[PDB]
Nucleic acid binder design. Structure first.
Ligand SMILES: [Mg+2]
Length: 134
DNA sequence: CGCGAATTGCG
DNA sequence: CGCGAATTGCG
């Protein structure tokens, strides 16, 4: 399998797991930032990766783009394809925002179709995903 | 740490 | 014993 350069890559920037979560999606070739989510005060890295993929799906659907999405998170890819985020994060006032976003992303998946291929970024083969925060 | 996949007590 | 609940590599 080879890299599809005409694609979108997503990744999460964490400050702890659980901890603050942000994410972005970038053009795999150029690095152009296409969308970003401001820091969510608490969530898990997995929840962030899930939100990042779904955000990418919504972005690409709006623009009628057929570009694939790359994610380095096998867990998030599975959650998106299952249309179910199997997170164990406690639901309380502290985590209300991340769970609101996750619940809404699930609702979107369960009420829409999409053509975007969702592909695993192979870090061991290809180096850093283009959306990496460092 | 959180995940999926795997391995490990009370009916 | 079964069936699951809970425990035990990778990022
Ligand atoms: Mg990541």
């Amino acid at each position: 399998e080879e890299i599809i350069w005409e694609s979108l890559s997503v990744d999460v920037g964490s400050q702890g797991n659980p901890g603050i979560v942000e994410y972005k999606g970038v053009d795999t070739k150029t690095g152009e930032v296409l969308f970003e989510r401001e820091p969510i005060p608490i969530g898990t890295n997995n929840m962030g990766e899930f939100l990042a993929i779904v955000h990418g799906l919504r972005y690409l659907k709006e623009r009628n783009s057929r570009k694939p999405i790359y994610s380095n998170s096998q867990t998030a890819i599975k959650w998106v394809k299952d249309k179910k985020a199997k997170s164990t994060l406690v639901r309380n006032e502290e985590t209300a925002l991340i769970w609101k976003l996750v619940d809404e992303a699930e609702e979107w998946l369960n009420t829409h179709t999409y053509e975007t291929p969702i592909l695993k970024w192979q870090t061991d083969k290809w180096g850093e995903i283009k959306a990496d925060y460092g």
